Design a protein around this ligand. Structure first.
Ligand SMILES: OC[C@H]1O[C@@H](O[C@H]2[C@@H](O)[C@H](O)[C@@H](CO)O[C@H]2O)[C@@H](O)[C@@H](O)[C@@H]1O
Ligand SMILES: OC[C@H]1O[C@@H](O[C@H]2[C@@H](O)[C@H](O)[C@@H](CO)O[C@H]2O)[C@@H](O)[C@@H](O)[C@@H]1O
Lengths: 353, 353
């Protein structure tokens, strides 16, 4: 691929963003959902804030109390032999290193808008902030699918009940309608297809499985974009490849003449994240036609390789302008970057590989 | 309360059922779904067959290969230092004790029918046998909800992709229609409510969660009993109590003047299973009104205590006859038993506790 990485990269960094919580630091502004509205590019940024502990032997978990509608910080000692603090994103029990007891930060969604796609201005206030008992550890990684005049904004809802995926709909980014947890825990990386397809709506999703099964992309159909069923396995991990550890939905499916083009992320077990592509049948998106054998975007620039969680590119949306895709991606779980690519080149790579 | 355990218990044992796979033994006929059809009680038995190995140092896992439509057997040495065989239901990686690599048996569904509710006769052939790539490790624990003339038969579908819940509909138990995986993995113990409730159908379900969340009962709504949404947390585990390790739905919700009566199973962390009860609001079954503090049925008969996996009662369905519930339950993951209880007495226990 001939990727054009934007000269202004990284576009938006934690320095650009002031914390909304007293005594917290912004540790990322990343993984932003992408929409066009009223002549501007909107990035629905995930902003992660972490409390600063006065004592460096203590870390705090920033948990939202749904009954009181405020944070209630929970403290943990670094030397507590019950807990493992080696993954900077979470507090883990040593007996459950496959999961977490708490996250180290709390996320919410805040919009940034651009007229030229390159220079962004933040909206004054947050857009979505934890509002119920399914979001007590944060709202994360908001995706946006526009169908007609309606924007479907769906996001990870993290709490003690699990990691679910929930939906808000809106025609203007001001008047919001909550549509509930559209996928049960454990799920995330939900991408709603941008039109009805032979009588059904579809969404990619990504169950995380305790007993058996890998971290694989699934698809579901829907009559109404509120209820989903007919769940099917779609894209699996591949041992020895860039997506040996996990795969998940990235950008919204892109209609091409050759099929639905899926720009998904893949990671190894070492947690290096890249973007790959797949192509699904136009008329029945449950059928996979081609998949890349090498990535379309990987961490190579310094901003991609270095940050809060290094060696990550994580694209949550893109805007098509003919053959050109303006892709926006989180980098290193820290900042937002932008690049342009050609859809025809992605298709070509699919064909070749 | 007082429980009328049938004099004929256990009603159906592995001794009553011949294996359909050469070189296998029936290890359980259990956890049967319950329906009334054409003047008879139908039990949709889970029949688990285990491949027998003449070498005691070796065990075998039965896998249905969805391409050849044939059983393949995977062998293991019991002294393999990478696997754990201590749970007789499963073959586990020592690095993943919270899950499984294989099961020790393969299940399918076979109908038994009765005129009197006590004496049963097996149908000649199986009813549902693994038929797709979601069912390679078996079809388990069929629940049946009858709405008008249509029987909704929904069951665990176990494979290398995860443990999903799938649905077949029928008006006659002869012509079957497959409706897909109505719940994505990891889920099971799905109980469809027996009527439309203020404009929506409902089902109990039970996400199993890798990262965070306990093994808790959830609820979802649906427009058509094919797709489900608006997932909500319903009944959680209680540390220190009979349901400290997990809860899941048992029988189909029973309409009472006081609300939807839910006969659920609970287990401790030591895997002792009992039945409990809860009461949901009649008009909004997302609201829990009452729950038992002590069980309504425990494993105390010899056939409940001793067998393939001892100290289990697991009721998957009941027939209502006025105030009497004729409840049928798996015992020790081995056999089927029946008892009669009274709806009014369970409601009374709910009120008292
Ligand atoms: O950190 C890489 C990548 O990992 C996943 O999210 C992680 C973290 O951000 C999140 O807070 C928790 C809980 O949902 O799950 C971690 O696995 C991605 O979904 C993405 O958000 C991260 O960029
Ligand atoms: O064994 C008790 C109880 O446990 C659950 O099922 C177990 C087993 O039968 C099943 O084969 C695997 C895979 O689905 O999960 C085990 O946990 C219950 O659902 C029930 O079937 C058993 O009676």
């Amino acid at each position: 691929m001939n990727i054009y990485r934007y000269e202004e990269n990284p576009l938006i960094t934690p320095l650009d963003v002031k914390p909304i919580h007293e005594g917290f630091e912004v540790i990322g502004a990343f993984n932003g959902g992408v929409a066009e509205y009223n002549g501007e590019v909107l990035l629905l940024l995930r902003v992660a804030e972490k409390p600063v502990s006065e004592d460096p032997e203590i870390v705090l978990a920033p948990v939202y109390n749904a009954k009181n509608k405020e944070l209630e910080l929970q403290s943990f000692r670094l030397d507590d032999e019950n807990y493992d603090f080696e993954d900077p994103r979470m507090i883990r029990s040593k007996a459950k290193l496959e999961g977490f007891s708490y996250l180290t930060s709390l996320s919410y969604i805040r919009i940034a808008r651009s007229k030229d796609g390159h220079h962004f201005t933040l909206d004054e206030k947050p857009f979505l902030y934890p509002f119920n008992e399914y979001q007590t550890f944060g709202i994360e990684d908001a995706r946006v699918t526009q169908i007609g005049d309606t924007y479907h904004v769906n996001f990870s809802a993290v709490s003690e009940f699990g990691v679910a995926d929930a939906l808000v709909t809106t025609k203007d980014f001001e008047n919001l309608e909550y549509q509930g947890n559209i996928f049960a825990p454990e799920n995330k990386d939900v991408l709603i297809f941008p039109e009805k397809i032979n009588g059904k709506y579809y969404a990619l999703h990504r169950p995380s499985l305790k007993s058996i099964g890998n971290l694989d992309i699934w698809i579901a159909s829907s009559p109404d974009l509120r209820s989903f069923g007919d769940h099917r396995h779609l894209l699996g991990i591949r041992p020895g490849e860039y997506d040996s550890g996990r795969v998940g939905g990235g950008c919204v499916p892109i209609k091409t003449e050759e099929g639905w083009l899926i720009l998904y992320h893949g990671a190894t077990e070492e947690n290096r994240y890249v973007m790959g592509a797949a192509l699904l049948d136009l008329n029945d998106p449950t059928i996979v036609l081609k998949r890349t054998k090498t990535p379309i975007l990987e961490p190579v620039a310094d901003y991609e390789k270095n940050g809060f969680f290094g060696d990550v590119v994580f694209a949550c949306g893109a805007i098509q302008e003919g053959d050109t895709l303006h892709m926006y991606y989180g980098v290193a779980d820290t900042s937002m970057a932008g690049c342009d690519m050609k859809i025809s080149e992605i298709l070509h790579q699919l064909e070749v590989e």
